[PDB]
Amino acid sequence: DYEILFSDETMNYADAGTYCQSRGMALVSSAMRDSTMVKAILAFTEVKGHDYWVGADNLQDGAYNFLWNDGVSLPTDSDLWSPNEPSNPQSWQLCVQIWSKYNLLDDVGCGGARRVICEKELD
Amino acid sequence: DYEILFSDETMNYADAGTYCQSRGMALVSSAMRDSTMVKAILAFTEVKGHDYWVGADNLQDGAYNFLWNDGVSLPTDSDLWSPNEPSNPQSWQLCVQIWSKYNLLDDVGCGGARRVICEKELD
Ligand SMILES: OC[C@H]1O[C@@H](O)[C@H](O)[C@@H](O)[C@H]1O
Ligand SMILES: OC[C@H]1O[C@@H](O)[C@H](O)[C@@H](O)[C@H]1O
Ligand SMILES: [Ca+2]
Ligand SMILES: [Ca+2]
Ligand SMILES: [Ca+2]
Ligand SMILES: [Ca+2]
Ligand SMILES: [Zn+2]
Ligand SMILES: [Zn+2]
Ligand SMILES: [Zn+2]
Ligand SMILES: [Zn+2]
Ligand SMILES: [Zn+2]
């Protein structure tokens, strides 16, 4: 069970994290690994047709060692990934978004402004 | 533009309003009148297949004089209403929810516990 917050305001990856945190929540992560919840989240984003940040990145171990912010791995072969992603250079600092082109996961640089999804495990 | 909060915690209508307000938000209302937003909101609740409160009731004016928490009228003949609703006895205190039966609006007593949706407009 969760509390899920969607925000139309855009910000970079770092600010997105602090945004959720200031609200007593976290950038969406365990909710994305929950089969029912992820379906509900993506139905919303499907309608909105915009890019949203998620709480995953390669900042700690680099390359395609993606980690959710709660420390659980985001497998490179996950079904959550958009077609042909992740594909950015492994030597880059990479953050994960829900890319509007496919309404699925995608690796990008952490500087662009995107909408935010926060979570809070209920409890 | 909005911040939208969905919560799996269940509460009666009054607790729902307090829960939203204590978060600097309001029980969903103007976002339900926004064409893009409402469809996104309903995509989510459709997946969840559960009942949720919305910020409309007849507490101020009674009967089928439904008002959104922000003073705007919820037309007894809005396309937002489930088929054959509103239909509860007009002498009752009636509150509005998104009824899982149709994933459309419905009038009910204000005492049953249901999931919550809060909104915060963004300028
Ligand atoms: O908008 C994001 C997209 O940017 C492209 O440059 C990149 O090749 C894609 O893999 C995807 O990340
Ligand atoms: O469960 C919700 C439903 O409850 C019924 O008793 C009522 O006839 C319907 O109009 C609807 O409000
Ligand atoms: Ca794939
Ligand atoms: Ca990419
Ligand atoms: Ca009707
Ligand atoms: Ca009814
Ligand atoms: Zn779950
Ligand atoms: Zn836009
Ligand atoms: Zn709008
Ligand atoms: Zn805008
Ligand atoms: Zn259930």
Curated annotation (Swiss-Prot), chains A, B:
Cystine pairs: C20-C118, C95-C110
InterPro entries attached to this UniProt entry: C-type_lectin-like, C-type_lectin-like/link_sf, C-type_lectin_CS, Ca-Dep_Lectins_ImmuneDev, CTDL_fold, TC14-like_CTLD
Annotated keywords: Calcium, Disulfide bond, Lectin
Domain of life: Eukaryota
Pfam families xrefs: Lectin_C (PF00059)
SMART domains, sorted: CLECT
Molecular function terms from GO: carbohydrate binding
PROSITE patterns (UniProt xref): C_TYPE_LECTIN_1, C_TYPE_LECTIN_2
Subunit record text: Homodimer.
Function, as annotated: Role in the defense system of the organism against microorganisms. This calcium-binding lectin binds galactose.
This protein's name: Lectin
Organism expressing this protein natively: Polyandrocarpa misakiensis (Tunicate)
